[PDB]
């Protein structure tokens, strides 16, 4: 495992497990947080522009060549980071790196191609907002932040038909620079990564355009749409990437409940709701931390009628954790759940490649799974309590959707 950083700023991370299928990804700090009010939704079209014809090769060739060897090219995007990943047999990853590095480094962005792609942008947004969780998290980020992290992952409705080739070219030229890029390869030799890192990934070498610092705003945005279930997320500002308080907040969500291990009533939250409400529900803890700011809170799905006190019950449980009402065995079980979740997240090949990638862009260094385990262990009970009080006090941001006739407000919550 290496993560040699090229002088251009590009980070070359390599590993040779000699796996039959090898996976090569490239990670750029070019998420949706780097747009402003003039180019909203540009990162969504850039994500969906993976198939556009580039100076390197024709869309047909690029496509037919990836499907000819049976390889896969995918784009995953968060609010901070974009990652373009190719995977395939070791005997075809040379042309796979040709295609991927052409897509990253030298796009053309022809106007007829993006004009054809805007309808696919609308279709992708509709498919993504077919479920309530996506819309309520986008609404929660929009009401929680002011400028940077409030920008949506998906393109707004008015911006469809207005995104041009020049905006995509400006975004690529201002954020796809070598100092914000890490090239990570599982199943490949480090050497080749470097040679492809000089034939490509070395020409664009500025630090690029620096983004604005994200500012918290608080507030609440609601959406009455007549769904059968009320979705509600109530968050507050939390720790950022690179602090031990982020580890405390991760231990706090695994204490409160995060993800159903069994096809998790034990969750403090789940227990506190289930002792009072017999209706179907789903209460969990939400944590999303980015390199300058984080959001931590509660997420509830419930019947509209009970939506109120269930939310109140969940909130009351966090207040109990803010009052020191916790046991050390519960924190130990939360730590075990968090470390098992981390190890099962990195046990797969694409998750391992993403992790290495993220670490690269974030800290330029690789942290062995082992190291993490002892740091999570560093988090201690009081630390967890502390993060809680942060949530219990910090101004909240609330995104609600459904039949909100009995959904409380923030001044009542």
């Amino acid at each position: 495992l290496e993560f040699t950083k090229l002088p251009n700023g590009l980070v070359i991370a390599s590993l040779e497990n000699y796996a039959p299928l090898s996976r090569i990804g490239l990670f750029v700090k070019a998420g949706s947080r780097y747009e402003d009010s003039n180019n909203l939704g540009t990162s969504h079209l850039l994500r969906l522009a993976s198939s556009l014809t580039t100076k390197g090769a024709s869309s047909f060739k690029i496509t037919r060549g990836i499907e000819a060897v049976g390889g896969k090219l995918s784009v995953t995007a968060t609010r901070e980071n974009m990652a373009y990943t190719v995977e395939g047999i070791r005997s075809d990853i040379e042309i796979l790196m040709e295609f991927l590095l052409n897509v990253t480094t030298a796009p053309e962005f022809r106007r007829w191609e993006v004009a054809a792609l805007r309808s696919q942008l609308k279709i992708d947004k509709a498919v993504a907002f077919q479920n309530s969780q996506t819309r309520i998290i986008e609404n929660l980020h929009d009401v929680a932040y002011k400028n940077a992290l409030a920008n949506p992952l998906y393109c707004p409705d008015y911006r469809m038909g207005k995104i041009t080739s020049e905006e995509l070219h400006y975004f690529v030229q201002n954020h796809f620079t070598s100092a914000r890029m890490a090239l990570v390869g599982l199943g490949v030799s480090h050497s080749v990564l470097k040679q492809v890192a000089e034939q490509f990934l070395n020409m664009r070498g500025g630090l690029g355009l620096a983004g604005a610092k994200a500012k918290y705003r608080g507030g609440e945005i609601r959406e009455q749409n007549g769904d059968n279930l009320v979705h509600a997320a109530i968050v507050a500002e939390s720790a950022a990437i690179g602090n031990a308080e982020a580890n405390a907040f991760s231990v706090l969500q695994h204490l409160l409940g995060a993800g159903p291990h069994i096809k998790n009533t034990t969750s403090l939250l789940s227990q506190s709701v289930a002792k009072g409400s017999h209706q179907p529900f789903d209460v969990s803890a939400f944590n999303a931390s980015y390199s300058d700011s984080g959001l931590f809170g509660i997420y509830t799905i419930s019947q509209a009628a009970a939506a109120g006190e269930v939310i109140n019950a969940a909130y009351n449980q966090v207040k109990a954790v803010a009052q020191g009402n916790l046991s050390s065995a519960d924190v130990q079980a939360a730590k075990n759940k968090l470390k098992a979740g981390y190890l099962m997240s990195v046990e797969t090949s694409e998750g391992f490649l993403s992790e290495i990638g993220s670490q690269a862009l974030a800290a330029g260094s690789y942290m062995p799974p082992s190291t993490v385990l002892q740091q999570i262990d560093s988090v201690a009970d009081a630390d967890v309590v502390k993060a809680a009080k942060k949530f219990v006090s910090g101004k909240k941001s609330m995104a609600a959707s459904g039949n909100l006739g009995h959904t409380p407000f923030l001044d009542e919550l």
């Binding site: 896969k72 090219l73 991760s250 979740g341």
Partner: protein, 48 residues
């Protein structure tokens, strides 16, 4: 991402598979409390 978002990681991890219920196939004639006003022959009018 998943480390923090957990179940919310997917919702915070927009992703396209690059190469390749479903979406159901998703303009009209042109300072004070608004007052909607319409009529049998009266055209719709926002009184503001």
């Amino acid at each position: 991402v998943a480390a923090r978002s957990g179940p919310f990681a997917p919702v915070l991890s927009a992703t396209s598979r690059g190469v390749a219920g479903a979406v159901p196939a998703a303009v009209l004639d042109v300072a004070r409390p608004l007052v909607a006003t319409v009529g049998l022959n009266v055209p719709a009018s926002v009184r503001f």
